Structure formats: structure tokens, C-alpha cells
Amino acid sequence: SMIFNVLTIFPQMFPGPLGVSNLGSALKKGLWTLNVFDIRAFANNKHNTVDDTPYGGGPGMLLRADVLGRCIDEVLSLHPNTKLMFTSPRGVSFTQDIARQTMNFDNITLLCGRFEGIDERVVDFYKLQEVSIGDYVLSGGELAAMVIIDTCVRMVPGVIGNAESLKQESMEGSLEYPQYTRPASWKGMEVPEVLLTGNHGEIEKWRRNASLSITAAR
Numbered sequence: 001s002m003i004f005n006v007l008t009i010f011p012q013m014f015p016g017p018l019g020v021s022n023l024g025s026a027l028k029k030g031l032w033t034l035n036v037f038d039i040r041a042f043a044n045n046k047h048n049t050v051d052d053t054p055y056g057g058g059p060g061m062l063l064r065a066d067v068l069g070r071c072i073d074e075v076l077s078l079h080p081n082t083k084l085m086f087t088s089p090r091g092v093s094f095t096q097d098i099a100r101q102t103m104n105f106d107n108i109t110l111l112c113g114r115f116e117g118i119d120e121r122v123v124d125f126y127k128l129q130e131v132s133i134g135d136y137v138l139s140g141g142e143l144a145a146m147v148i149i150d151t152c153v154r155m156v157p158g159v160i161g162n163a164e165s166l167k168q169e170s171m172e173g174s175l176e177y178p179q180y181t182r183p184a185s186w187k188g189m190e191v192p193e194v195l196l197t198g199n200h201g202e203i204e205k206w207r208r209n210a211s212l213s214i215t216a217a218r
Contacts, residue, residue, distance in 0.1 A: 001030070001031070001032060001033060001106065002031070002032040002033070002103075002106055002152075002153070002156050003032070003033040003035065003079065003082075003106065003107045003108070004032065004033065004034055004035070004108055004109075004110065004149050004152075004153075005035040005036075005037065005075050005079065005082065005107075005108070005109040005110065006034070006035070006036045006037065006109075006110050006112065006142070006145050006149075007037045007039055007068075007071055007072070007075070007109065007110065007111045007112060008036065008037075008038070008039065008112040008114075008140075008141070008142050008145070009038065009039045009040050009050055009063075009112075009114055010114075010140070010142060011036045011037070011038045013142050014034065014036045014142075014146075015027065015034055015036075016146065017146060017150070018034065018146055018149055018150060018153075022154075022159050022160060023150065023153060023154075023159065026153070026156070026158060026159040029158070031156055031157075031158045031159055032153055032156055032159075034149075035075075037071055037074070037075060039063070039067065039068065039071050041071075042067050042068075042070040042071040042074070043064075043067050044070070045064075045066075045067070049064075050063055050064060050067050051063055051064065051114070051115050052064050054116070058116070059116060060115045060116035061115040061116060062115060062116055062117055062118060062119055063113075063114065063115065063117075063118045063119065063122075064119060065118075065119035065121045065122050065125075068111070068118060068119070068122045069122065069125070069126075072084070072109075072111070072122070072126060075109055079107050079109070081107060082105075082107040082108065082109045083102070083105040083107070083108050083109065083129065084109050084111070084126055084127070084128050084129065085108060085109060085110050085111065085128065085129045085130075085131050085148075086110075086111045086113070086118070086123065086128040086129065086130050086131070086141070087110065087111070087112050087113055087130075087131060087132075087133075087140075087141030087142075087144035087145055087148075088113055088117065088130050088131075088132065088141070089132050089134075089135065089136065089137055089138070090130065090132065091129070091130025091131050091132045092129065092130065092131050092132065093132050093134070093135075094131050094132060094133045094134075094147070094148060094151070096151070098131075099148075099151045099152050099155065100155065102148075102152055103152060103155055103156075108152075110141075110144075110145040110148060110149070111128070111141070112140055112141030112142045112144065112145050113140055113141040114139075114140040114141070131144070131148065132144075133147045133148065171211070173211075173215065174215065174218075175211040175212070175214065175215040176211065177207040177208075177210045177211045178192075178210050178214075180192065180195055184196070192206070194206045
């Protein structure tokens with residue numbers, strides 16, 4: 001199959017957008033699995049806190065190493081051969097191709113940051129693969145984990161009928177092309193006539209030409 005384990009202190013966010021349209025359908029269908037672990041549950045600490053202030057001081061809090069380890073050990077006990085990852089804005093920049101490389105593993109674990117980060121020992125002891133969906137700071141790692149999961153799950157088979165699947169890959173580069181649909185006029189803007197001709201050859205040809213412009217503006 002294809003399993004994703006998410007470690008967060010906001011489990012109520014999930015599946016959120018991950019549970020809707022094809023993505024949710026296939027999830028119920030069981031084409032993929034979504035295990036969401038509440039990190040808060042692992043605190044055996046009497047203060048039952050997950051965060052704490054940082055040695056050396058400064059702002060905000062940091063997720064405690066002992067708590068995260070209890071959580072991570074449980075996931076490992078349950079999925080020993082799992083690729084441990086961690087969302088932070090200063091790691092491997094996530095791309096459609098990195099996604100593909102992740103498909104090679106069929107069991108990924110995504111720890112989501114919160115507050116000012118996590119105790120470094122966890123990064124080191126467990127050898128986490130830091131991943132960044134882009135050059136911006138979020139309130140936490142969970143939107144990141146969603147973006148990653150959405151990106152990868154779309155390349156599982158059965159989630160997207162082979163029609164839209166062999167396609168998208170046809171466009172090859174970010175170009176794609178202008179697309180149009182009914183009405184034929186809208187605010188007096190009419191559809192390029194070639195699309196209305198039924199001429200597959202002449203339409204593919206126009207679509208490659210339009211694919212090259214717009215991109216030419218890049």
C-alpha cells in the first residue's frame with residue numbers, strides 16, 4: 001500500500017483537506033493510510049507539557065526530546081522500516097521530483113514542528129530528513145506535511161484515473177496551456193476558434209505553440 005504517519009500536537013487538523021475529493025475517497029477506499037499521532041499523549045511528565053523553555057534562553061518554546069522520543073519509538077515499534085522526516089524551512093527543498101523519490105519508500109513519517117522548533121538531539125539521534133516546502137515560515141509543520149502528503153498521494157495509482165494521470169505528465173514543463181470551456185463568449189471574450197473545430201492535429205499544434213509563449217515570459 002502506501003502509509004503516512006503524521007506526528008503533531010494538533011491532531012484535529014487532520015485529515016482536513018487531505019480527506020476530500022479523490023484524496024479522501026481513496027483514503028476511505030484504503031488505497032493509502034493516514035496515521036495521525038497526538039504528541040501530547042506521550043507526555044508522562046506530571047506537568048504533562050510537551051514544550052518547555054530553551055536552555056540558554058530566548059523566545060518561545062521547544063518540543064522536549066524525551067516526549068518526542070517516546071512518540072517516535074512507538075511509531076518505529078509499529079513501522080520499523082519507515083523514512084523519518086521533519087518539516088522545517090531550512091531543509092531539502094521539496095519538489096515534484098523529490099516527491100517521486102519518496103514513492104520509493106512505502107511508509108513515511110512526518111514530524112511537524114511547533115513553537116520555535118525541536119530539541120536538536122531528536123534531529124541527530126534519529127537522523128531526521130529535514131524537508132522544506134518553500135522559503136517561508138509557517139506557524140508549524142502541519143500545513144507542510146499536508147502539502148507533502150497531497151503531492152505524493154496523487155502519484156499513487158487509483159487516486160487519479162489514468163486519463164488525468166498520463167496527462168499532466170504530457171505537458172512536461174510548468175507550461176501546460178490556456179484552457180477554455182463553455183460559454184463560447186463571456187463578457188464578449190470568445191474562445192480561440194481552433195478549439196471549436198474538432199481538429200485534433202491542429203489543436204495539439206496550437207496548444208504546443210501557446211505552451212511555448214507564457215513560458216517565454218519566464
